Design a protein around this nucleic acid. Structure first.
Ligand SMILES: [Zn+2]
Ligand SMILES: [Zn+2]
Ligand SMILES: [Zn+2]
Ligand SMILES: [Zn+2]
Ligand SMILES: [Zn+2]
Lengths: 585, 49, 134, 586
RNA sequence: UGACUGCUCCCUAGCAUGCUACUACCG
RNA sequence: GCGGUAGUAGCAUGCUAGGGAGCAG
């Protein structure tokens, strides 16, 4: 019994056929029911014919017996149709305001999430629509993952390998670690305790995070949770203060981050600022500068992971005293230098996973592009702070959309705040290119970055250009090409100093074929930023919309301090990139 | 009555069908409880030593 | 294993109430009306304070139903009414009816026979068994 | 109490009362069944009969709804309501009724008393829940058949292997041999205990008790019956051929003793079921044991019509497989007992359709497909939902004894739902590895039914025989006795005393109860013969009737010889074919 | 995990009965 | 002008049934 979405009037009905079942208002509920197959509605009891053993379950299909609801095939002579009057029968039948055009709401509800139009809906919607949308995505995707087999390790041969089958009738989960399993073992009766695993090109290659050795009958599935509803908005209705009052102006400063202090000064004069954070532009350095500028701040460092907030904790105690940092790791092995399980902490780093709900000082959010509207409202649902900052950039990396089928969504509508730096403009920027030199940086500036990032350093001609083609042939959930893999060593051979690099590749099983040829380590394309060498070899091995789109392996090209490799078999952006070209042997 | 005493059967048939619905349930619950009682007996004797 | 104590009751009666001139039936099954039942149960009340308290209560017996041995109660030994034997007890039964399933799930025989011994030193009432582990 | 009807699969609560098995019937669908038969009594949670104290009426439409009761017109209260009306009989779920326009298929099965071959053309060429209803109706009416007969009282005892025996009153008498094995039980003063498994034959009553026992006075026998309860799974799943043999274990090494086998298994893991063309002694019992080594990782389901038939599957069981990985469930019957018994979770579980409990396994291998019908056909899959399926055997060896089929015997081809398939889809496998009979008989059985399909094994040593005779037969109770051919038997058997190292073959096995006293020669049952044989077998077909010299019955008797059988073919039925050594008849 | 009774109030349903009015047919 | 039956609604009493509760030994 709460307030309906489209009305905010206190109601008692919840659309039954609807996935997440939000509270709906009598007139507003009727509007939702008139345009869909969402034709079942639950009140304190479900609106279904309770004549013993019936079948009817549509709402208008029923009439109010006295203590019951019946179909016409059951209704007593004294009946009263539930759905009538343009207003469905429920509590608070008087306080109903509706919305004239709710096909916005019905469209979200009737949205099965297949096309990019679905996420144009998810963002270009209105608010409680926005939380309903993100939560519907999550719900239907954790229902997605379990339409698949039970990964039974049913023989064990060697280590790093398994003999593995699955359940019946179900297609199969993909190849790598965005879909990390977490199996659990049985005894005679019930289910207890294996761990975090994923299965890749073998023969089944499993990359278990923790130490364990598996036995017979050992099974795995992507164990799921219960996504419960959200509360706070994705972002508060923010505004810029008149003076930075209540915030502590410090006397002394470090000009290691002279690109930082003019950036913080109005941030205390304002609620939120999402920053233009190009890769390695001192963005992880950025939030640590304010840490010293305002050491009096309970400043909220959050990211998509303690693999991402990992980077926020990289220079944590290296810059701040020790006992003033803390991270809540729930009962996952990542950084553990801190004191753990202390929320009342001057500096609390964490992930959207499990920082408990409090009130703090200034929010600093890494990973804004890949995280969406769901966890966007999480930190503010977590926490009502002084002021807000999001570190990162939609110029990095979206999320993997398990159900988006037709035509990947813009970089620009990643989330409700991502449009803002493309409709309001960048609140901050950092062009301090500590990492890549004049090699790549402006060629990424003429890409999407406003001609905006300057040269760092000379151009030592170490990031490379290769004009190739290759031949690809498909398999389950990868794509394998050795005409370019053959080019890889062919590239890597004429100087053995080549091969001090990390292999970059989209279809990371193409490294499961390459690792046996070179011994070279693997680079995940999307989970890459934050990690890099000056030397990285990259076989894009595909030119499709999966592959050479604008801002995906964009994160892979900028991995080099000075010397990356790009066998651009694509004509997608090769027409731009300004690097050293040679003949192809 | 070609419309107002039969209508009175559309009462009696409804009632009788409801009653025999209820009795079918009552006879399924009985078989279930019988299985339960006898499996309790046969599982408690096997402890008998 | 002794539960009868019918000769002992008669010897007690003859030792202490020798000239009480009214028939004493140790087992009140043989009594003639309710007044004879009261009369003879009165004496049983006294004479049963002599005999061991583990010899009262249901008298069980190993019957065979569906070729499997049950332990079921085929009588009772009341402190007031003496020994009473069931009249319709049958040993090899093919299968149980609803009524017999009932009257066998209600008996404390199968329940007590298949539980842990119990010595409950909180009370003085004669504990019997512990149908659980805690 | 309440399930889904056969012809409709809607959830109903009405069971045809006059119908034998009483399947759930759907309101409209039940009415369709009731309009065309004398199946005119229908039971719901209570039976639809006039419960006015002491009435007689029991037809359904004959009744009207009287409030808390059902009455006839002679009893109906002024306020009534006819039960059977509206084209829809009154029961639960009166709305969800779909019917079938032509259910005279169903009525025909129900009104089928099982007399002609048309009855079993119905039983197979029917639809599905029809098929289980049909097989189950056969069984039901036949276990009701056997007990229309006397109580076999052994009322005097003279000697061993003999009894003085009478029966009950008014009843005809059961036949002569062991397809109808009795299982009598003895009394004391009150009730009925143990005796055992017995059958009575030509004496003077010759009893062949399986176990040891010695009988007394008043000792009685009947064919004790059971309660055939309904059957779930289909006779055979809607099968299909996989795209690769995935989930099955390709082994590296192989035995080429069965080089006629490995190419046969390879697609069987690429497919659900394969029933194989298994001619007699074509390594068929050898066949399933080859995959046993090829896929030693298989929980492979060896089933047959008996541990006299799965006996043959267990013949080379431990001789080829390690010991503790085999098991057979023998319920509380003396046959093979080399195994560990009472272990279902076993790597190799052999058993009969009698009592292997219900589990899920790997690949099914079913001996005895021709003689077993649609009933136990669905048993193994009702037993078990496996990886894949195989049926060993052949409709080219024998049917079942049809106790009620009376007109002409049914085709070899519609023995069962899968038996037509190797005659409408074709043989899924074949084995022509004739390790047994030589060029003598094998192709003369190939030009018989077998597609000109089985090659010669070996030379033709002229030891299987041809004799062109006639004989004279006279009849008795349930046998047929002829000595003009029995006289030919020794007359055949005399001119070389090396003749008589053979087993007598004969249809009317009492004709051996007359022959055994003349020769000392052992007996061969004609139909329960396959799997057992000598190189030397003497056969007096002693009849040319449809009982006798039909195509594929003693077909199993001719192929008994390694090299040397005897065939006094008094028939002109197939004598016009058989290519063997002919001599004059002395 | 909820015992056996007894009384009482409230709500609903059903049926008959009983009472009264409106309409209809026939005598 | 009356009677009767049939209908319908209103109203009452009672009985049964179903549910919620209170007190008592
Ligand atoms: Zn909805
Ligand atoms: Zn209904
Ligand atoms: Zn007495
Ligand atoms: Zn019938
Ligand atoms: Zn009647």
């Amino acid at each position: 019994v709460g307030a309906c979405v489209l009305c905010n009037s206190q109601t008692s009905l919840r659309c039954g056929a609807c996935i997440r079942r939000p509270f709906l208002c009598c007139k507003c509920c009727y509007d939702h029911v008139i345009s869909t197959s969402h034709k079942l509605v639950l009140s304190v009891n479900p609106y279904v014919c309770n004549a013993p053993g019936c079948d009817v379950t549509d709402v208008t299909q029923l009439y109010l017996g006295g203590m019951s609801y019946y179909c016409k095939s059951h209704k007593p002579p004294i009946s009263f149709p539930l759905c009538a009057n343009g207003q469905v029968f429920g509590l608070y039948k008087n306080t109903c305001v509706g919305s004239d055009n709710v096909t916005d709401f019905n469209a979200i509800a009737t949205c099965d999430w297949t096309n990019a139009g679905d996420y144009i809906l998810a963002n270009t919607c209105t608010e409680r629509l926005k939380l309903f949308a993100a939560e519907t995505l999550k719900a239907t995707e954790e229902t997605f993952k379990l339409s698949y087999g039970i990964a039974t390790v049913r023989e064990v041969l060697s280590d790093r390998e398994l003999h593995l089958s699955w359940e019946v009738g179900k297609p199969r989960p993909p190849l790598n670690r965005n879909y990390v399993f977490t199996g659990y073992r049985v005894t005679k009766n019930s289910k207890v305790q294996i761990g975090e695993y994923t299965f890749e090109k073998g023969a089944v290659v499993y990359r278990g995070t923790t130490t364990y050795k598996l036995n017979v009958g050992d099974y795995f599935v992507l164990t799921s949770h219960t996504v419960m509803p959200l509360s706070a908005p994705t972002l508060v209705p923010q505004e810029h203060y008149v003076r930075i009052t209540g915030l502590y102006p410090t006397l002394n400063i470090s000009d290691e981050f002279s690109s930082n202090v003019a950036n913080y000064q109005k941030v205390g004069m304002q609620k939120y600022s999402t920053l233009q954070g190009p890769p390695g532009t001192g963005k992880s350095h950025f939030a640590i500068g304010l840490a010293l500028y305002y050491p009096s701040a309970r400043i909220v460092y959050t990211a998509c992971s303690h693999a991402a907030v990992d980077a926020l904790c990289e220079k944590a105690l290296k810059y701040l005293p020790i006992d003033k940092c803390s991270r809540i790791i729930p009962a996952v092995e990542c950084f553990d230098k801190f004191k753990v399980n202390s929320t009342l902490e001057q500096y609390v780093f964490c992930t959207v996973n499990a920082l408990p709900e409090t009130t703090a000082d200034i929010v600093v959010f890494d990973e804004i592009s890949m995280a969406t509207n769901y966890d966007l409202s999480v930190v503010n649902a977590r926490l009502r702070a002084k002021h807000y900052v999001y570190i990162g950039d939609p110029a990095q990396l979206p999320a993997p959309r398990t159900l988006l089928t037709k035509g990947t969504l813009e970089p620009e509508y990643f989330n409700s705040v991502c449009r803002l730096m493309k409709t309001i403009g960048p609140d901050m920027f950092l062009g301090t290119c500590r990492r890549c030199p004049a090699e790549i940086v402006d060629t990424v500036s003429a890409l999407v970055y406003d001609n905006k990032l300057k040269a760092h350093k000379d151009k030592s001609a170490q990031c490379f250009k290769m004009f190739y083609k290759g031949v690809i042939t498909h398999d389950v959930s990868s794509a394998i090409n050795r005409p370019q893999i053959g080019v890889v060593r062919e590239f890597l051979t004429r100087n053995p100093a080549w091969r001090k690099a990390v292999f970059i590749s989209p279809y990371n099983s193409q490294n499961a074929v390459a690792s046996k040829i070179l011994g070279l380590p693997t680079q995940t394309v999307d989970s890459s930023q934050g990690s890099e060498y000056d030397y990285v070899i990259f076989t894009q091995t595909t030119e499709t919309a999966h592959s050479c789109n604008v801002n995906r392996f964009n994160v892979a090209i900028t991995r080099a301090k000075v010397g990356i490799l790009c066998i651009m078999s694509d004509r997608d952006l090769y027409d731009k990139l300004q690097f050293t070209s040679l003949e192809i042997p | 009555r070609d419309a107002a005493m039969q209508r009175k059967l559309e009462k009696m048939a409804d009632q009788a069908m409801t009653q025999m619905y209820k009795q079918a349930r009552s006879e399924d619950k009985r078989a279930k409880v019988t299985s339960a009682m006898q499996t309790m007996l046969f599982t408690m004797l096997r402890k008998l030593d | 294993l002794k539960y009868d104590f019918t000769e002992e009751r008669l010897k007690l009666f003859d030792r202490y109430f020798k000239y009480w001139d009214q028939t004493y039936h140790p087992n009140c099954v043989n009594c003639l009306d309710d007044r004879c039942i009261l009369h003879c149960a009165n004496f049983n009340v006294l004479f049963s304070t002599v005999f061991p308290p583990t010899s009262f209560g249901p008298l069980v017996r190993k019957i065979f139903v569906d070729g499997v041995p049950f332990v079921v109660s085929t009588g009772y030994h009341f402190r007031e009414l003496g020994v009473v034997h069931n009249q319709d007890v049958n040993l090899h039964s093919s299968r149980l009816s609803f009524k017999e399933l009932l009257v066998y799930a209600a008996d404390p025989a199968m329940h007590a026979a298949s539980g842990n011994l119990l010595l409950d030193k909180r009370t003085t009432c004669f504990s019997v068994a512990a149908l659980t582990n805690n």
